[PDB]
């Protein structure tokens, strides 16, 4: 009968309790106890599916990653590069997903608490699309040295910029978040060229569907859409007070995350078959 | 702002039950509980119990199980509590205080004194 | 039934000193804890929350800290209208518990 707390409006929250204006009762009172937040995840409020989706989206991933790399070496034609490659991304995801859940149930914890887990979960999504970059790279320049490692090298330079700008303080005043957003623009747009480089060094056609470029388009469109519903917080947007428990924007664009990885990590498996089975010479026929 | 009224004084014999009366204003009654303190003079504060006007209940202190008894009036917005069977002892200004998520005070009434004299 | 021991008994001093009032429980409450203050014949009015938290509207010159078992309110700058008695309680375990009280007078 200890750690007691009911759900209370939008109107009493704490200052840095207040992200969301359209979500007007079902909040968790501040606690400053991790035995209380961790407790509270079996429990309904406003963060329930937000802890819940991210938690399983991370057993998941976890089950695929340790499963992947059980996988013999004679599947594989180079085992230890592509295990490792396959590692960055299974990591990633890992990593941003176990942020995410960590983050959301200790978010009512205190302010200082909420602050550290926010940018650990920034920075897990940075590790998310570097690890997300690490095996397209690998399994679509496999036959060209020079422009994988140079592609690689601007991914992670970016990708590690873009954790340590969210992650030292000093820098939340007005006038650096404009460098904090450059920093991860240059990551996220890092991929248009390389994904050009691709389709150009090889047949658009051949490219679009066994190139398996369309499902890379297909997260791409998933990936964006998912950060426009969160910017734009719909559908609690039109509806404010009718999607306080489930489906919220942040619910959704979680779904998207996890559904973006996976479609990914299918993307790249094809990648991986098409690969194996064929291509992989340069200029002889005989 | 939120604000609580009491009930005015009360002057009873031995073995009288009095109720204190708390009427709630400036919130929605239901979105928080409601706790009751005893301060006899002198004294610190006891918390005597808690009370979920959401769904009734109730939690009391075993120091008070069968002297106090809170009641709801969900209509007027109103709080009650009941003290039956009054000795010497329960001379003392009673609270209603509101909580807010955690079991913290951030709104009370103006005390009710229960004077008790034959 | 946690014990809240509040101390000291009383204590005064003169404006613009500062002041401390220690809390010791005999278990832990994990930062459920607030401290309150109460002027003579009025309603106790809350102080802090959460342990550290400032309460809204209260002046600056009021802090809280710990954790554990021991927390203490500290009170900088002393102003005339801050005497009275201050209560500590915890609300982490049922039944609710509040501190013994401090007087606290101005010179």
């Known amino acids: 009968s200890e750690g007691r707390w009911r759900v209370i409006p939008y109107d009493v929250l704490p200052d840095w309790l207040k992200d969301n204006d359209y979500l007007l009762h079902g909040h968790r009172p501040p606690m400053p106890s991790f035995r209380a937040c961790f407790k509270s995840i079996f429990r309904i409020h406003t963060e329930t599916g937000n802890i819940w989706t991210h938690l399983l989206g991370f057993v998941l991933f976890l089950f695929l990653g340790i499963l992947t790399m059980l996988r013999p070496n004679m599947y594989f034609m180079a085992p230890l590069q592509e295990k490792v490659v396959f590692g960055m991304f299974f990591l990633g995801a890992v990593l941003c997903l176990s942020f995410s859940w960590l983050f959301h149930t200790v978010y009512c914890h205190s302010e200082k608490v909420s602050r550290t887990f926010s940018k650990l979960d920034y920075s897990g999504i940075a590790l998310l699309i570097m690890g997300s970059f690490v095996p397209w790279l690998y399994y679509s320049f496999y036959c060209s040295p020079q422009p994988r490692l140079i592609y690689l090298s601007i991914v992670c330079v970016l990708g590690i910029s873009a954790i340590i700008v969210a992650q030292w303080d000093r820098f939340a005043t007005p006038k650096h978040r404009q460098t904090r957003a450059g920093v991860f623009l240059g990551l996220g747009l890092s991929g248009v060229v390389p994904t050009m480089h691709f389709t150009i060094a090889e047949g658009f056609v051949k490219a679009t569907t066994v190139g398996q470029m369309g499902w890379f388009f297909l997260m791409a469109v998933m990936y964006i859409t998912g950060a426009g519903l969160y910017a734009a917080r719909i559908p609690e947007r039109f509806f404010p007070g009718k999607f306080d428990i489930w489906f919220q924007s942040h619910q959704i664009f979680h779904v998207l995350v996890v559904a973006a990885a996976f479609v990914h990590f299918y993307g790249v498996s094809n990648l991986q078959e098409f690969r194996y089975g064929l291509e992989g010479g340069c200029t002889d026929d005989t | 702002e939120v604000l609580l009224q009491q009930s005015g004084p009360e002057l009873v014999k031995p073995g009288a039950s009095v109720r204190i009366t708390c009427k709630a204003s400036g919130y929605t009654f239901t979105d928080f509980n409601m706790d009751w303190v005893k301060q006899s003079p002198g004294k610190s504060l006891e918390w005597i119990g808690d009370?979920?006007?959401?769904?009734?209940?109730?939690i009391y202190n075993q120091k008070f199980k069968d002297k106090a008894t809170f009641t709801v009036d969900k209509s007027s917005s109103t709080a009650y509590m009941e003290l039956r069977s009054l000795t010497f002892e329960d001379t003392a200004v009673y609270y209603c205080?509101?909580?807010?998520?955690?079991?913290?005070?951030?709104?009370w009434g103006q005390g009710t004194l229960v004077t008790v004299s034959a | 039934d946690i014990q809240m021991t509040q101390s000291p008994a009383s204590l005064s001093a003169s404006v613009g000193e500062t002041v401390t009032i220690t809390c010791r429980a005999s278990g832990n409450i994990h930062n459920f804890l607030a401290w309150y203050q109460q002027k003579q014949g009025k309603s106790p009015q809350v102080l802090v929350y959460?342990?550290?938290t400032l309460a809204d509207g209260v002046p600056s010159r009021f802090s809280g800290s710990g954790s554990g078992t021991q927390y203490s309110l500290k009170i900088n700058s002393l102003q005339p209208e801050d005497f009275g008695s201050y209560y500590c309680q915890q609300f982490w375990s049922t039944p609710y518990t509040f501190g013994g009280g401090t007087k606290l007078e101005i010179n």
């Open positions: 959460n342990a550290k």
């Open positions: 205080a509101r909580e807010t998520g955690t079991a913290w005070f951030a709104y």
């Open positions: 009370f979920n006007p959401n769904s009734g209940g109730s």
